[PDB]
Ligand SMILES: *[C@@H]1O[C@H](CO)[C@@H](O[C@@H]2O[C@H](CO)[C@@H](O[C@@H]3O[C@H](CO)[C@@H](O)[C@H](O)[C@@H]3O)[C@H](O)[C@H]2NC(C)=O)[C@H](O)[C@H]1NC(C)=O
């Protein structure tokens with residue numbers, strides 16, 4: 001699971017679950033979908049299960065990524081897409 | 088509240104309470120009242136609520152002070168007076 | 175108490191108890207009995223109560239030692255002997 | 262009757278300090294005399310003594326956060342009376358990279374009146390971990 | 404009958420390791436079959452199984468204190484028998500400036516006899532925080 | 546009937562993550578409707594609500610151990626169903642020399658069915674302290 005709730009003009013709640021395996025450290029990576037380049041990356045504990053993103057551009061289709069790590073071994077990159085609103 | 092209990096020759100129990108606000112770090116300051124100069128200052132967690140003073144001079148009127156801090160904002164300096172005993 | 179359980183070819187479980195006093199840090203020291211020289215020493219919390227030794231030589235009579243410390247004061251060196259098995 | 266509860270944690274976009282909970286996973290609501298209201302509080306309907314408990318697990322950093330500990334408080338709103346604190350726990354932020362994980366556990370015996378609500382709040386909710394098992398909140402009547 | 408207790412902490416000029424408590428704030432003493440004696444112990448009058456708990460919160464520093472952890476122990480004095488330890492918890496002192504805050508929580512099911520007294524003691528009482536909620540001690544009969 | 550338990554810790558040569566316990570010291574087994582099986586689990590025989598708790602104390606070091614916290618989990622094996630996690634707690638390893646001591650406490654209200662077994666496991670069992678009082682595990686039926 002990797003859900004995207006409460007998407008507004010500038011913000012969005014990312015959540016996930018502890019089903020993948022015995023992982024420890026993960027990278028929440030996001031940025032504008034199909035405007036190649038600028039990407040924000042965020043180190044999170046696997047069992048933290050949430051991050052709230054802010055300072056997003058309105059009316060913009062974003063792209064979220066979540067790969068998780070146990071030592072040198074790494075998890076299946078779990079993706080999700082979302083589009084901010086406008087006002 | 089800022090009470091002074093168990094005053095003896097050389098010692099005294101200072102106590103206070105968590106009524107002032109959402110403060111974090113405080114300065115318990117004391118010294119001889121009206122012998123201008125030498126003052127002892129003690130960093131304490133706001134929610135610690137107690138300090139026991141020692142190595143005080145007997146038969147001496149002391150003065151206690153307690154200002155508390157939340158970032159740059161600071162609390163109402165709460166004072167109290169006490170006089171050690173003798174033997 | 176200072177017991178030695180589960181002695182096998184290469185391994186052994188050392189256990190003890192919290193009866194000696196109010197000690198803090200201890201030294202579990204072992205090595206081959208009567209082959210003078212090479213000794214392994216292991217810093218342990220007094221209230222940890224266990225260490226599992228590995229990489230021991232088979233068919234060999236070993237010697238365990240346990241002195242415990244509270245500041246500069248030190249405990250009665252509590253010894254024990256054990257002999258590994260073979261296969 | 263047997264009156265107990267246990268509700269798991271649930272993240273949200275609130276900013277406000279009051280933790281959110283849900284009747285999900287291995288939750289418990291014995292009967293309607295204990296209720297979870299608006300995902301934020303366990304409200305009781307019978308007067309008496311309860312053992313209320315809560316467990317906050319959180320990941321924090323000393324450099325990222327301000328010079329102030331993580332405080333979790335278990336609070337009581339009784340009807341027709343002011344807010345009250347029952348239990349509190351404080352933990353310094355860790356020096357560990359990305360963050361340092363630690364758990365708090367509050368538990369105690371208090372007298373709830375009818376319509377009384379209990380809730381758990383924290384200094385920084387963004388730091389609270391919400392993985393299966395890690396953060397939960399409950400109650401049981403003596 | 405319903406036999407439970409919960410007493411809040413109270414600072415004192417004792418030096419001795421045994422923590423002091425008071426029937427103040429949101430305390431509980433159900434009936435005279437549980438009593439708080441001399442501010443230091445919860446004494447029972449009926450034989451049986453109890454869930455005893457205590458929560459110590461403390462502020463400490465690694466440089467100021469000696470190379471030794473903060474130990475809180477929940478002890479039992481039964482009549483006509485030696486002292487006994489039931490539960491213990493240990494915490495290293497923090498590296499944080501002035502001090503670093505942390506909470507312990509002990510809780511367990513034990514068999515008390517009639518006239519048995521339980522109490523909580525610590526390595527360094529001067530380090531124990533006494534703010535509303537932070538340090539408390541209680542009991543409840545099954 | 547009164548159905549409660551409390552078992553003390555006991556070291557072993559297992560490597561496997563499941564903690565071992567014993568009916569020793571100030572243990573409690575009220576009657577045969579709660580049992581300690583193979584030193585690893587508290588199995589119940591009657592359906593209903595229980596407050597299950599456990600306390601792990603451990604000594605660890607940040608440099609010696611891998612970049613990963615100490616996790617203790619309280620698990621449930623029900624008959625004819627998969628394994629389940631009920632409660633978890635996580636703690637970063639300390640920066641203290643030889644090791645740094647800290648305690649976890651898990652406690653919660655869960656519904657056990659008949660023949661259900663609960664157990665406590667940890668990331669690194671070699672780090673678990675086993676001195677009198679420090680590490681224990683129990684249960685009590687509502
Ligand atoms: C969790 O919730 C509790 C209850 O709402 C919070 O406690 C409350 O905190 C506020 C802010 O510091 C206190 O307000 C202050 O009141 C005093 C006395 O009237 C006044 O001197 C200050 O100017 C300020 O208005 C409030 O009294 C206090 N309530 C109680 C019952 O203690 C707490 O802050 C929350 N905890 C966390 C960790 O967020």
Ligand SMILES: *[C@@H]1O[C@H](CO)[C@@H](O[C@@H]2O[C@H](CO)[C@@H](O[C@@H]3O[C@H](CO)[C@@H](O)[C@H](O)[C@@H]3O)[C@H](O)[C@H]2NC(C)=O)[C@H](O)[C@H]1NC(C)=O
Nearest residue numbers: 193194195196420474475476478485486487488524525526
């Ligand atoms: C909290 O209180 C308990 C109970 O009074 C304290 O435990 C006791 O600590 C003393 C001092 O280390 C122990 O005395 C020792 O007894 C052994 C065996 O007879 C002897 O070898 C030593 O020379 C010393 O006399 C005492 O046995 C021990 N009692 C029990 C029941 O374990 C404890 O120190 C206090 N805890 C804190 C954190 O202050």
Ligand SMILES: *[C@@H]1O[C@H](CO)[C@@H](O[C@@H]2O[C@H](CO)[C@@H](O[C@@H]3O[C@H](CO)[C@@H](O)[C@H](O)[C@@H]3O)[C@H](O)[C@H]2NC(C)=O)[C@H](O)[C@H]1NC(C)=O
Nearest residue numbers: 019020021022562616617618620627628629630666667668
């Ligand atoms: C304490 O014991 C529990 C229960 O046995 C352990 O939880 C289990 O951990 C394993 C290993 O990560 C999980 O296996 C994984 O399953 C998922 C989903 O099928 C799969 O994607 C992975 O490839 C892997 O096979 C298992 O699901 C999990 N069980 C539960 C109920 O969560 C736990 O690891 C132990 N805790 C400690 C601290 O040792």
